[PDB]
């Protein structure tokens, strides 16, 4: 997507796939996926329970990346409905919808 604001979307598309890979690395750190309650906290604060000797990362398990464009913070949620995780960023208008740059941009795995 090579247009103003969509150019912010195309960056985040690589960043979200980055997070999805690191969430798989938290999957390794706690030999399991986080829960949308305990594991969300365990994505922001060290996981309570038994994590393996692995360097835990906050912010939802991210790479060496800043936050998403438009000054929005990443929304990282753990398995909601059917899917092992839910992560996304809000669109340029601060809303989760379907659009180019006004869409919620994220990815997850189910």
Swiss-Prot record:
It is a single-pass membrane protein. Keywords: Cell inner membrane, Cell membrane, Membrane, Methylation, Protein transport, Transmembrane, Transmembrane helix, Transport. Cleaved by the prepilin peptidase. One of its GO terms (cellular component) is type II protein secretion system complex. Its main location: membrane. Residues 89-110 are annotated as: Disordered. It is found in: Cell inner membrane. One of its GO terms (biological process) is protein secretion by the type II secretion system. It comes from the Bacteria. Belongs to the GSP G family. Core component of the type II secretion system required for the energy-dependent secretion of extracellular factors such as proteases and toxins from the periplasm. Pseudopilin (pilin-like) protein that polymerizes to form the pseudopilus. Further polymerization triggers pseudopilus growth. Type II pseudopilus confers increased bacterial adhesive capabilities. Type II secretion system is composed of four main components: the outer membrane complex, the inner membrane complex, the cytoplasmic secretion ATPase and the periplasm-spanning pseudopilus. Forms homomultimers. Interacts with pseudopilin tip ternary complex made of XcpX, XcpU, XcpV and XcpW. Interacts with PilA. This is Type II secretion system core protein G. It comes from Pseudomonas aeruginosa (strain ATCC 15692 / DSM 22644 / CIP 104116 / JCM 14847 / LMG 12228 / 1C / PRS 101 / PAO1).
